[PDB]
Symmetry: C2
Subunit: 126 residues, 2 copies
């Protein structure tokens, strides 16, 4: 099984969001619930100016690929700016957050070593 | 453990290359051999005009995130064009290749659900 996706391909998929992540929204591009793919899953996220993916953790490792804008990555308490062209490795259990303090949309893919997004449980910072 | 990488971060690391895939060069940005990360590993690769990542396969599932240019993806016999903005899902052991037909450099990240690149064995197709 091999397939190609971009944002245009998922226009018919409504954005996902939640009130806990203000100004954040996402779609699934590679995911067993949509594609019958396995082993790896990938989403595209946008954080609007002033938006905040608040401090959280989860069991699998995660990678971010930043494709647009800039924001402040909270590395379990240590702040670092990130921007287009950056990739981020987040170990399992590691608390992290990402704030868009800029005027452009902060856009990134995330990747999990899992079949599905739905099998990753998000936990709030303890 | 959380870290950020970009091209500048690995300016020190020399471009890897081979003859199996002429015109192709790459670096490792998230990799146990370098970072002691685990769960996922990620590299960045460049294909010069004329370059040809030839038909191969490997056990782990794989994702490409295409960040510049355009190319022709060989999906186990069926051709599809890919370009900047595209993501590609490649099932474990599915045969695939990627050729740069454009004039610009074809650039992409690849991602494996493995700790390190070095542990993945590439197999030409028969
Ligand atoms: Mn996360
Ligand atoms: Mn491959």
């Amino acid at each position: 099984m091999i397939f190609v996706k971009n944002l245009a391909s998922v226009l018919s998929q409504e954005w996902s969001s939640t009130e806990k992540y203000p100004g954040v929204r996402w779609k699934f591009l590679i995911d067993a619930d949509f594609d019958g793919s396995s082993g790896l899953s990938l989403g595209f996220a946008e954080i609007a100016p002033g938006g905040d993916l608040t401090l959280h953790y989860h069991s699998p490792a995660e990678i971010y690929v930043v494709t647009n804008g800039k924001g402040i990555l909270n590395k379990s308490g240590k702040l670092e700016t990130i921007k287009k062209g950056d990739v981020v490795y987040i170990a399992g259990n590691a608390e992290h957050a990402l704030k868009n303090n800029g005027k452009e949309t902060l856009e990134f893919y995330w990747i999990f070593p899992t079949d599905r997004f739905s099998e990753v449980e998000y936990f709030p910072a303890k």
